[PDB]
């Protein structure tokens, strides 16, 4: 998955590019899908980033493969399938961690 992620921009850019109602539906949908993904990154504290670290530990429940093998002789398509039943879980955890982190920062900033 390393080589596959050397650049995350070529596939990130131009996702907003270019009776007749169906053409509007296609355009409206493209915008909505774009915004939904950006919305999710924002609430996880990853706005503006393609790669971000978080404070949610990785569970062996989700996967018990080591970093070797996961990140090398494998790709993203089967990876996504292997952990497809945990995405709701992970997203919920990311949301909770971000909310607590912002509160903690607000308090530290107020204290000094």
């Amino acid at each position: 998955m390393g080589a596959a992620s050397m650049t995350l921009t070529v596939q990130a850019r131009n996702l907003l590019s270019g009776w007749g109602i169906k053409q509007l539906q296609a355009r409206v949908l493209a915008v909505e899908r774009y915004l939904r993904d950006q919305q999710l990154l924002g609430i996880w504290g990853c706005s503006g980033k393609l790669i971000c670290c978080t404070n949610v530990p990785w569970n062996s429940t989700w996967s018990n493969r080591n970093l070797s093998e996961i990140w090398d002789n494998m790709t993203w398509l089967q990876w996504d399938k292997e952990i497809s039943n945990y995405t709701q879980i992970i997203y919920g955890l990311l949301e909770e961690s971000q909310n607590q982190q912002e509160k903690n920062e607000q308090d530290l900033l107020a204290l000094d």
């Binding site: 998955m1 596959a4 992620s5 650049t7 995350l8 921009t9 596939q11 990130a12 131009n14 996702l15 907003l16 590019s17 270019g18 169906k22 053409q23 539906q25 296609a26 355009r27 949908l29 493209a30 899908r33 774009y34 993904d37 999710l40 990154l41 996880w44 504290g45 990853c46 980033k49 393609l50 790669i51 971000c52 670290c53 978080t54 404070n55 949610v56 530990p57 990785w58 996967s63 970093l67 996961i70 990140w71 790709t75 993203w76 398509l77 990876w79 996504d80 952990i83 995405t87 992970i90 955890l93 990311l94």
Partner: protein
């Protein structure tokens, strides 16, 4: 030890059904519709394709029907044609079978009651010397606007942002299963929306061998689509030099009638070289036997109007032909000309196709066949109808997927 890392731009996709749009390179209904003007090899991708579950086919079927109705809708409705019609036969310099093929009819159109006359083909008129125009009594017949062209032009289907089209490059892909040579495109190759039955005209050829495809090769209820690796040229003509007669209907409303034929009357026909056909059919059977068994000798049979005869739109005029003799220097297929057209498989509204002045000649490429099944040796017959198979023969290599560029994986880092 490991933490969740979030990645955006992840190269992952899922099967999806979306709305695709039309594009082209440069009066024609597709030219006024396809206003949008107009590859990447994936090194280790093995994707599953299924041409009979491909919604791109349904999209063409729907778009084409809608485009036709949209174009025919704002044209004169031939209300005053449903009148008692009076007819006699044409006896003027007719080559022996067109005896009884052309009729000379007259009627009173909207004091008004103007008596007019026109010629009709036998297939257009039904008796009650008292006649009625066929099917005008069950549905409205409208006249296609003469300024509208239905000539097929290449159509490219293009993905909306967030979607991509995967293409199978496997030289022998049989319509289903995994494909190990997958590339991505934004737009398909151009497909000409040629409408025909039995023989598929002006499509893309197979690159190495004849490819025989079906949902289930042993199920006789399904059609077999055969893609040839060489084209067969077919020459179709309507030898009669006719003229058109403009008849006023009303306040700027005009009917286009078939006028009198200038010169002799001759039978419409199509022809194919014998050697080419013979070898072509030979190529098909060599490979057809791989699914049905060896120790067999070549044998075909003719068909069971649009399904039993070959049908195409020739030069802008609907043309039908007898394929018997292809399936049983050149072979000539007799042909018939018809007006009052019930498109696809509808039994509702019909279109009146105005005549084209002058002798009509068209030459086209036979690129594939639709065959059905009737030890028991070969027993195959031409099949056809539905017209979705006409697009399956071009779209079989394409699939639409949704890109979902967001996911997670464990990493060694932690946010500070």
């Amino acid at each position: 030890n490991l933490w969740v890392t979030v990645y955006y731009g992840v190269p992952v996709w899922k099967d999806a059904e979306t709305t695709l749009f039309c594009a082209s390179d440069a009066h024609n209904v597709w030219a006024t519709h396809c206003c949008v003007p107009t590859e990447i090899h994936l090194e280790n991708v093995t994707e599953e394709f299924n041409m009979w579950k491909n919604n791109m086919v349904e999209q063409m079927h729907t778009d084409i029907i809608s485009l036709w109705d949209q174009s025919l809708k704002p044209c004169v409705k031939l209300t005053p044609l449903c009148v008692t019609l009076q007819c006699t036969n044409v006896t003027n310099n007719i080559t022996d079978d067109m005896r009884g093929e052309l009729k000379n009819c007259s009627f009173n159109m909207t004091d008004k009651k103007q008596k007019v006359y026109s010629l009709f083909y036998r297939l257009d008129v039904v008796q009650i010397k008292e006649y009625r125009l066929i099917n005008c009594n069950t549905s409205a017949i409208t006249q296609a606007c003469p300024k509208v062209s239905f000539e097929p032009i290449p159509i490219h289907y293009c993905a909306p942002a967030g979607f991509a089209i995967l293409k199978c490059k496997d030289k022998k892909f049989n319509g289903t299963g995994p494909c190990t040579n997958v590339s991505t495109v934004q737009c398909t190759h151009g497909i000409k929306p040629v409408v025909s039955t039995q023989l598929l005209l002006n499509g893309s050829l197979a690159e190495e061998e004849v490819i025989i495809r079906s949902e289930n090769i042993t199920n006789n209820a399904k059609n077999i689509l055969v893609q040839l690796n060489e084209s067969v040229q077919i020459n179709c003509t309507r030898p009669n030099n006719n003229t058109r007669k403009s008849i006023r209907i009303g306040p700027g409303q005009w009917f286009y009638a078939t006028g009198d034929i200038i010169g002799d009357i001759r039978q419409a026909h199509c022809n194919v070289s014998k050697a080419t056909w013979n070898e072509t059919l030979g190529k098909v059977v060599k490979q057809l036997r791989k699914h049905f068994g060896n120790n067999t000798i070549i044998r075909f049979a003719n068909s069971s109007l649009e399904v039993t005869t070959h049908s195409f739109n020739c030069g802008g005029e609907f043309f039908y032909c007898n394929t018997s003799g292809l399936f049983n220097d050149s072979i000539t297929l007799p042909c018939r000309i018809k007006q009052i057209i019930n498109m696809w498989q509808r039994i509702g509204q019909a279109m009146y196709a105005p005549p084209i002045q002058g002798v009509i000649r068209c030459v086209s490429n036979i690129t594939g066949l639709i065959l059905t099944r009737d030890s028991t040796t070969e027993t195959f017959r031409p099949g056809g109808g539905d017209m979705r198979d006409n697009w399956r023969s071009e779209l079989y290599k394409y699939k639409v997927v949704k890109i979902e560029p967001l996911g997670v994986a464990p990493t060694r880092c932690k946010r500070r």
